[PDB]
mmCIF file of C-alpha atoms in Angstrom:
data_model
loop_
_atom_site.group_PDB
_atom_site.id
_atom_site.type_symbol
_atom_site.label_atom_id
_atom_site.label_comp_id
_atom_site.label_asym_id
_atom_site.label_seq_id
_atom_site.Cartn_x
_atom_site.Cartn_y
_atom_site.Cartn_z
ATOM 1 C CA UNK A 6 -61.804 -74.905 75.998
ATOM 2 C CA UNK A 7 -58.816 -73.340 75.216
ATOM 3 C CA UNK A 8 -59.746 -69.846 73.544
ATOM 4 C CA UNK A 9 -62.270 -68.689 75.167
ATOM 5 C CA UNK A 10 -60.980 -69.551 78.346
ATOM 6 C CA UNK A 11 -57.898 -68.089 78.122
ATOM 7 C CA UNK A 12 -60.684 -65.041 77.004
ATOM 8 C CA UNK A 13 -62.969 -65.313 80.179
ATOM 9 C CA UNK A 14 -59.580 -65.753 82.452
ATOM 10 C CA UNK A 15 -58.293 -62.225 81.276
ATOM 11 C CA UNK A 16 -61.696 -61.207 81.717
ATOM 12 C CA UNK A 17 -62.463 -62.699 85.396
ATOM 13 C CA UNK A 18 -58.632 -60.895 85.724
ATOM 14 C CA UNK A 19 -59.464 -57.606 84.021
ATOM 15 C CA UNK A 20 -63.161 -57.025 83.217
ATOM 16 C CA UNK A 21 -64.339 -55.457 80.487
ATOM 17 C CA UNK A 22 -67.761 -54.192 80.240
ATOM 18 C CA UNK A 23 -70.162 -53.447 77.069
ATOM 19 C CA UNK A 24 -68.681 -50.102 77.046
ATOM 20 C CA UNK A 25 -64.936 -51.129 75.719
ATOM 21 C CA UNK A 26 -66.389 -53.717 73.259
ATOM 22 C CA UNK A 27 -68.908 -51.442 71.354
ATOM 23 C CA UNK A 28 -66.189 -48.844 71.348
ATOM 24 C CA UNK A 29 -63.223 -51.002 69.891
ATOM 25 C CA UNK A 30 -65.134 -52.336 67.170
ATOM 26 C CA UNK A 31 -64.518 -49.926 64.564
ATOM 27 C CA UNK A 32 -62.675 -47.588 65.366
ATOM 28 C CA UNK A 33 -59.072 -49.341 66.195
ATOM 29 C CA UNK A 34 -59.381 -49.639 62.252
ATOM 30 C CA UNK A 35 -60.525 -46.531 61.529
ATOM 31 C CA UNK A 36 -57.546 -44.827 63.271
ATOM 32 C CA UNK A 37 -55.620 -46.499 60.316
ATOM 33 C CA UNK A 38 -57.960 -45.497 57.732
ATOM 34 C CA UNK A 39 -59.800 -48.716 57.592
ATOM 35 C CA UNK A 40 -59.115 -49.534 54.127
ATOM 36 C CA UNK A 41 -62.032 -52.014 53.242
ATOM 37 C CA UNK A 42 -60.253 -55.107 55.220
ATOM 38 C CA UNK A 43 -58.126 -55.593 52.121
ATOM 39 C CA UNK A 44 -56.799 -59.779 51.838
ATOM 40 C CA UNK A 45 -56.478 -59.656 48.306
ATOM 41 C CA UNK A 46 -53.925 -57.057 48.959
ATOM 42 C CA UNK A 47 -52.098 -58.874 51.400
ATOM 43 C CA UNK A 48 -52.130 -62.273 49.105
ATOM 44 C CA UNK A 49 -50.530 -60.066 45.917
ATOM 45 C CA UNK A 50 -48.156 -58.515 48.614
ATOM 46 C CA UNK A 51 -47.051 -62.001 50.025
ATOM 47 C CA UNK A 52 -46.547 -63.086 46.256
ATOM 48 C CA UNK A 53 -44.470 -59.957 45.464
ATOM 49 C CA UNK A 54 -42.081 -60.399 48.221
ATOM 50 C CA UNK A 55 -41.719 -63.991 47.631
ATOM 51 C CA UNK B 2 -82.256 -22.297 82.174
ATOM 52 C CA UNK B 3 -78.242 -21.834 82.262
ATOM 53 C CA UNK B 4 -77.669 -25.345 80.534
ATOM 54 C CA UNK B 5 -80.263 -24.447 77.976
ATOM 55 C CA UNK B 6 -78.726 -20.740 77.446
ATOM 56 C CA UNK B 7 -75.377 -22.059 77.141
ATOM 57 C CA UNK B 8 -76.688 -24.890 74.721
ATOM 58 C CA UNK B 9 -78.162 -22.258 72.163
ATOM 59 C CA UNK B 10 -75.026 -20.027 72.522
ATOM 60 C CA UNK B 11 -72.876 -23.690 71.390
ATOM 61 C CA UNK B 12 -75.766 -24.571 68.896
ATOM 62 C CA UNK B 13 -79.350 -23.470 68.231
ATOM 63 C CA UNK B 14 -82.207 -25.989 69.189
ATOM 64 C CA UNK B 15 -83.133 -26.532 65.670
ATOM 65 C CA UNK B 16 -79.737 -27.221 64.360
ATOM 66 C CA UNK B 17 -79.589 -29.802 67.384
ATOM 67 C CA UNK B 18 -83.177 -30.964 67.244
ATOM 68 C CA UNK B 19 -83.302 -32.006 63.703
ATOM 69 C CA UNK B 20 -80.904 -34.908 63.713
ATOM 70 C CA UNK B 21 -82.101 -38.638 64.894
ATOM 71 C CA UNK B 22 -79.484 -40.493 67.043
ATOM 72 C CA UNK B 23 -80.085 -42.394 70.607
ATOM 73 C CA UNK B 24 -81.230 -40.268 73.904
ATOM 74 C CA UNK B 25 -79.464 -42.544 76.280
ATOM 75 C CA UNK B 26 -76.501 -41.138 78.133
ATOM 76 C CA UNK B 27 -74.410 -44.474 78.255
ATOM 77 C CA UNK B 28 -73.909 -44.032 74.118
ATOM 78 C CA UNK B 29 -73.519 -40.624 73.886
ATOM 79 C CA UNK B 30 -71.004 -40.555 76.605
ATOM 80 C CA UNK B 31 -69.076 -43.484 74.765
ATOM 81 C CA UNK B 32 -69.164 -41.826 71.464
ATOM 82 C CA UNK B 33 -67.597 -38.489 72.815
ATOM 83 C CA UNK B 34 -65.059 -40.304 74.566
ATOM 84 C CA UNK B 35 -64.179 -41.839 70.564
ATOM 85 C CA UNK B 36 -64.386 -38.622 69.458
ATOM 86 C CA UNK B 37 -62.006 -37.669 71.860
ATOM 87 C CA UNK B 38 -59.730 -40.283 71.522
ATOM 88 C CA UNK B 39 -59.943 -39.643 67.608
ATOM 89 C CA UNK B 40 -59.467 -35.857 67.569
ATOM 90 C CA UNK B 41 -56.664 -36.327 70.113
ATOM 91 C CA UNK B 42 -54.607 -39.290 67.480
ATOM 92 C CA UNK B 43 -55.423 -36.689 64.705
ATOM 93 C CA UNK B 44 -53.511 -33.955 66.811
ATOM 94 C CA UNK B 45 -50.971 -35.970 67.449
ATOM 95 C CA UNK B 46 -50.489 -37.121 63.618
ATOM 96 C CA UNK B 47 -50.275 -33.567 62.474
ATOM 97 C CA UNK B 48 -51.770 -30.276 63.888
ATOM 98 C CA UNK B 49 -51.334 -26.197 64.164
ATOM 99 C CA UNK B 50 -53.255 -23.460 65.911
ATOM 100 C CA UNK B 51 -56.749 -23.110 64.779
ATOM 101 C CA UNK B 52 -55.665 -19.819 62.431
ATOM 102 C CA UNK B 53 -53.141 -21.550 60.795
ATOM 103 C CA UNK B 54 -55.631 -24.017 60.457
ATOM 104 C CA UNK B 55 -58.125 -22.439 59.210
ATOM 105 C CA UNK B 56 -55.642 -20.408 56.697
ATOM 106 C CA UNK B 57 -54.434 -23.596 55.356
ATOM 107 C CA UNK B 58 -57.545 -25.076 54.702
ATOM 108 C CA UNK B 59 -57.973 -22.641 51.611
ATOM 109 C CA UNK B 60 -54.278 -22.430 50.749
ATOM 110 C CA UNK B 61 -53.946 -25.933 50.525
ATOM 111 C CA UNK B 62 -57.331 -26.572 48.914
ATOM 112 C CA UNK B 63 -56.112 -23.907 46.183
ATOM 113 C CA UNK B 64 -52.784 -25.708 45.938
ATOM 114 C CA UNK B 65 -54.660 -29.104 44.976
ATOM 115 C CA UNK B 66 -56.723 -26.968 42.825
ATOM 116 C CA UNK B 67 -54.398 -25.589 40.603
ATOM 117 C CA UNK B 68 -52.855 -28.713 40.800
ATOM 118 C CA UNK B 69 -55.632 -31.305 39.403
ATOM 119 C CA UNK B 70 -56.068 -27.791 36.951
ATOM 120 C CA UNK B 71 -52.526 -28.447 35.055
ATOM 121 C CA UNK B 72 -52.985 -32.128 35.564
ATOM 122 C CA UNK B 73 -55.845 -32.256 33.782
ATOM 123 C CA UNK B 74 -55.307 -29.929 31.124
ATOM 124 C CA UNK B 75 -51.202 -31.708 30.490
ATOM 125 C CA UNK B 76 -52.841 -34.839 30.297
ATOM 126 C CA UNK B 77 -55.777 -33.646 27.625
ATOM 127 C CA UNK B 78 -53.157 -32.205 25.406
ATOM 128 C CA UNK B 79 -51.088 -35.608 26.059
ATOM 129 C CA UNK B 80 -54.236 -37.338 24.985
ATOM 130 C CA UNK B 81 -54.509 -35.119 21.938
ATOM 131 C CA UNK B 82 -50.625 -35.096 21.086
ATOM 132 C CA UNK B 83 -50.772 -39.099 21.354
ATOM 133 C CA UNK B 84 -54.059 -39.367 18.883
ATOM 134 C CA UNK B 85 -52.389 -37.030 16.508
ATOM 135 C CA UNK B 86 -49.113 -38.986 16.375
ATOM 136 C CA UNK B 87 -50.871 -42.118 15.236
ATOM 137 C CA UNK B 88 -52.486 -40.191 12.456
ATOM 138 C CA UNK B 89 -49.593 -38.874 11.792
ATOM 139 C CA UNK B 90 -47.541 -42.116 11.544
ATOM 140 C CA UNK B 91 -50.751 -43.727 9.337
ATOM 141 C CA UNK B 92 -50.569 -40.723 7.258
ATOM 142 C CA UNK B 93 -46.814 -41.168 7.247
ATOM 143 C CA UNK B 94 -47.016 -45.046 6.232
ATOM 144 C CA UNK B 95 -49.762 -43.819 3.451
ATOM 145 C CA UNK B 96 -47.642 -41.498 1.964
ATOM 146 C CA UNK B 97 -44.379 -44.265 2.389
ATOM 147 C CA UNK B 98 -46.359 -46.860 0.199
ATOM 148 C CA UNK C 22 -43.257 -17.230 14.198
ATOM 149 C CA UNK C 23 -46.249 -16.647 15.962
ATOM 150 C CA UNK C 24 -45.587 -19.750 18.475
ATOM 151 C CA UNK C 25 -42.078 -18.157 18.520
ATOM 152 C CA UNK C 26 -43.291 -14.874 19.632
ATOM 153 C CA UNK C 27 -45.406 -15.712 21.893
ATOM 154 C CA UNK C 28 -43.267 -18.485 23.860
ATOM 155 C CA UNK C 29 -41.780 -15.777 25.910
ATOM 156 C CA UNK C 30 -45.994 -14.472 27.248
ATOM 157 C CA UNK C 31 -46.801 -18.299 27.792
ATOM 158 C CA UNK C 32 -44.078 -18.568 30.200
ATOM 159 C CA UNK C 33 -44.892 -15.360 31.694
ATOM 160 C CA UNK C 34 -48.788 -15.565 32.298
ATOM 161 C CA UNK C 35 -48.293 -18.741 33.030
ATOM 162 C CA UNK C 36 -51.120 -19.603 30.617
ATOM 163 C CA UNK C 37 -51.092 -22.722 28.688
ATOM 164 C CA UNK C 38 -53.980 -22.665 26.481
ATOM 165 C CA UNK C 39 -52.559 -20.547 24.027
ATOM 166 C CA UNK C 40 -50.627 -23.555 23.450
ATOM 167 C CA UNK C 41 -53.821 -25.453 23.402
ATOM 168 C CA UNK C 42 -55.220 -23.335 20.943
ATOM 169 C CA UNK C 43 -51.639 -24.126 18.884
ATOM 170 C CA UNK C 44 -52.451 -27.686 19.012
ATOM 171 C CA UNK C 45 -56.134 -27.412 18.341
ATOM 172 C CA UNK C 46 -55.390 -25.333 15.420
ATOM 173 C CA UNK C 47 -52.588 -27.789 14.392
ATOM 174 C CA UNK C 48 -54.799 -30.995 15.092
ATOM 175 C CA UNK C 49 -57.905 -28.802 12.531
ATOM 176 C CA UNK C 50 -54.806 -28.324 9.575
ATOM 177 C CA UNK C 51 -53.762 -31.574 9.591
ATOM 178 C CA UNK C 52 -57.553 -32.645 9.611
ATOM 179 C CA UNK C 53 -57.323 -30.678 6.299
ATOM 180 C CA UNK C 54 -54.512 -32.055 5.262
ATOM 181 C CA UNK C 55 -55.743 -35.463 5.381
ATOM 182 C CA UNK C 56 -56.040 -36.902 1.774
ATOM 183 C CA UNK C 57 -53.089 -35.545 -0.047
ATOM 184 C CA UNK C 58 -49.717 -36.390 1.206
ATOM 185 C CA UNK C 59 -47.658 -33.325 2.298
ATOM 186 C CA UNK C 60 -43.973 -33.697 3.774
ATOM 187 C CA UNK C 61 -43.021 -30.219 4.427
ATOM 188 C CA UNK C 62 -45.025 -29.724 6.825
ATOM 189 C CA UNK C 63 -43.900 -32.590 9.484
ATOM 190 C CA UNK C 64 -41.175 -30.789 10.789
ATOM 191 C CA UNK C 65 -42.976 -27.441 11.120
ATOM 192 C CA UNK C 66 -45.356 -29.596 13.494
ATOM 193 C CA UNK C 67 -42.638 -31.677 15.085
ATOM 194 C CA UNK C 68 -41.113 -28.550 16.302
ATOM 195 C CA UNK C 69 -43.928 -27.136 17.440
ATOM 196 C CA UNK C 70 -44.973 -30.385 19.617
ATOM 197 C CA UNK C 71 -41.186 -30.188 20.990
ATOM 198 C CA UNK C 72 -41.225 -26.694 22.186
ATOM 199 C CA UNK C 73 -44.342 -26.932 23.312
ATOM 200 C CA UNK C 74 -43.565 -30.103 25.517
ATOM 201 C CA UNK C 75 -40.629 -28.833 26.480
ATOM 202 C CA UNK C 76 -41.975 -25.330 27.303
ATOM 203 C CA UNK C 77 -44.734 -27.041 29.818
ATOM 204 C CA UNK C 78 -42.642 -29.314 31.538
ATOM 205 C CA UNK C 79 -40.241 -26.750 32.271
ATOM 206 C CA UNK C 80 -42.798 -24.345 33.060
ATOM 207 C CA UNK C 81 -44.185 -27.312 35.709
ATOM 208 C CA UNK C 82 -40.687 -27.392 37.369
ATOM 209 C CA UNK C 83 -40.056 -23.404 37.298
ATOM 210 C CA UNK C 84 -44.143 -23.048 38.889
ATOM 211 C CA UNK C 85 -44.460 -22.194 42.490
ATOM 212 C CA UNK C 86 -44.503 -25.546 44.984
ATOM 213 C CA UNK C 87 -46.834 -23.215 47.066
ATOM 214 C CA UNK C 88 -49.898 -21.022 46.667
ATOM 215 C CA UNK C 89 -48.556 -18.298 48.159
ATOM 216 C CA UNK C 90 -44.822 -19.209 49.092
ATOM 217 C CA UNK C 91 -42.633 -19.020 45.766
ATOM 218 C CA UNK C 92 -40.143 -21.831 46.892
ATOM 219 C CA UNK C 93 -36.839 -20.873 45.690
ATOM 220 C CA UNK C 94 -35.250 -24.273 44.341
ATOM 221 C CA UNK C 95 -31.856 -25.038 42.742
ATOM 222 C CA UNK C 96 -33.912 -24.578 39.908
ATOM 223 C CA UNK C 97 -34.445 -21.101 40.487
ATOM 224 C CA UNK C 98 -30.825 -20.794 41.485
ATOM 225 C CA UNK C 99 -29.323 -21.929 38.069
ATOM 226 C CA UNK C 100 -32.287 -19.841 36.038
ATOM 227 C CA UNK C 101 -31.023 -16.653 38.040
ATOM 228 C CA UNK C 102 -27.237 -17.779 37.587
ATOM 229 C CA UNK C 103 -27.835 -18.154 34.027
ATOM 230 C CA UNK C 104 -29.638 -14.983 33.017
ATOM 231 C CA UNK C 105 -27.204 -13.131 31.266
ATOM 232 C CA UNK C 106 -28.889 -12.298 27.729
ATOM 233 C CA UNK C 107 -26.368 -9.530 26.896
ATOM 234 C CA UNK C 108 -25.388 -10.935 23.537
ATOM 235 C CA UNK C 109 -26.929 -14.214 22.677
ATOM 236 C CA UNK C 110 -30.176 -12.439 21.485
ATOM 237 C CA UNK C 111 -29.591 -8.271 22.524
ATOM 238 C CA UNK C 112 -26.645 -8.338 20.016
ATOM 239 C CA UNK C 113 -26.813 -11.874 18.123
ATOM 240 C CA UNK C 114 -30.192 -11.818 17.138
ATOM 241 C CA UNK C 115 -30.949 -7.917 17.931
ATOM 242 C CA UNK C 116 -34.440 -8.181 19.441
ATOM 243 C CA UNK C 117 -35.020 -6.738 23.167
ATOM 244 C CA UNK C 118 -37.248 -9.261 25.344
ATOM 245 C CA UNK C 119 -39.997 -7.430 27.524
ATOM 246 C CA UNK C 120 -39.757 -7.434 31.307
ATOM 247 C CA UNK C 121 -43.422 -7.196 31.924
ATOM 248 C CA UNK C 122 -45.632 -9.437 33.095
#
């Protein structure tokens, strides 16, 4: 109701095929070096700047 | 016969031939335009002609090599000068008692 | 006087393992050693531990950054300022040190 709409609005307003999704799955991660989706790092990173 | 001339003179048949990916044209269009995309962010990170390049690939490979070399070898004889201080200060507290 | 000697190749060739040797052979003595108590020999090995620590991490600094390109720091601006060996060990200590490599 409220996610995916706003989702399929942008859509409806700029469509996106198969094409765009199966390419930024990946690979917008992988430009950064994709470091195994670290959390754990960002929880001991939150508790060392607090 | 010209796209198959100019394919051998890129690579040979059997160097192309041998791997297994998809023969649809939608994916293999999608993955050069990654490739693309990828190879044109690495440029743009850091990048020189293709000599200077391929020069530093060995230079800098050497570098790191002689490198990890003395690393490896300072910490061995750190490992070695660390053991034989604690003997030394046992031997030290032996001959203190 | 061996270690003493020889200080001046290890910083030339650049070689290290002679002072690996040093410490191997220094590591095998003490080995011996172990099982009578012997006090004279602690500050023959002390010294040789400090000049050979010292020797390699100034040797590290005083190495080329580069392969190829010999980066001329201001480390190797105050080792050619301070060169001058005319009397400290031509006339205090009367030995000539080589100049090749």
């Amino acid at each position: 109701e409220k996610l995916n709409k706003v989702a399929e609005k942008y859509e409806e307003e700029g469509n996106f095929n198969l094409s765009f999704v199966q390419d930024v799955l990946d690979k917008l991660e992988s430009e950064i070096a994709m470091v195994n989706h670290d959390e754990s790092a960002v929880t001991i990173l939150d508790q060392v700047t607090a | 016969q010209r796209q198959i001339q100019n394919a051998c003179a890129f690579c040979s048949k059997e160097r192309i031939e041998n791997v297994d990916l998809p023969d649809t044209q939608e994916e293999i269009k999608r993955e050069l335009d990654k490739v693309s995309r990828m190879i044109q962010k690495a440029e743009k990170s850091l990048g020189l002609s293709q000599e200077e390049v391929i020069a530093l690939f060995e230079k800098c490979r050497n570098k790191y090599k002689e490198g990890q070399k003395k690393y490896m070898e300072i910490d061995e004889a750190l490992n070695r000068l660390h053991n034989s201080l604690k003997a030394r200060d046992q031997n030290y507290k032996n001959a203190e008692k | 006087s061996e270690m003493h000697k020889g200080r001046a190749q290890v910083t030339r060739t650049g070689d290290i393992g002679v002072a690996m040797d040093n410490l191997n052979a220094v590591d095998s003595l003490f080995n011996k050693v172990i099982g009578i108590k012997n006090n004279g020999l602690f500050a023959h090995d002390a010294r040789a531990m400090v000049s050979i620590s010292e020797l390699a991490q100034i040797s590290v600094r005083n190495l080329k950054f580069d392969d190829s390109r010999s980066m001329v720091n201001l480390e190797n601006i105050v080792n050619s300022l301070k060169r001058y060996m005319l009397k400290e060990h031509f006339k205090l200590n009367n030995i000539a040190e080589n100049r090749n490599d």
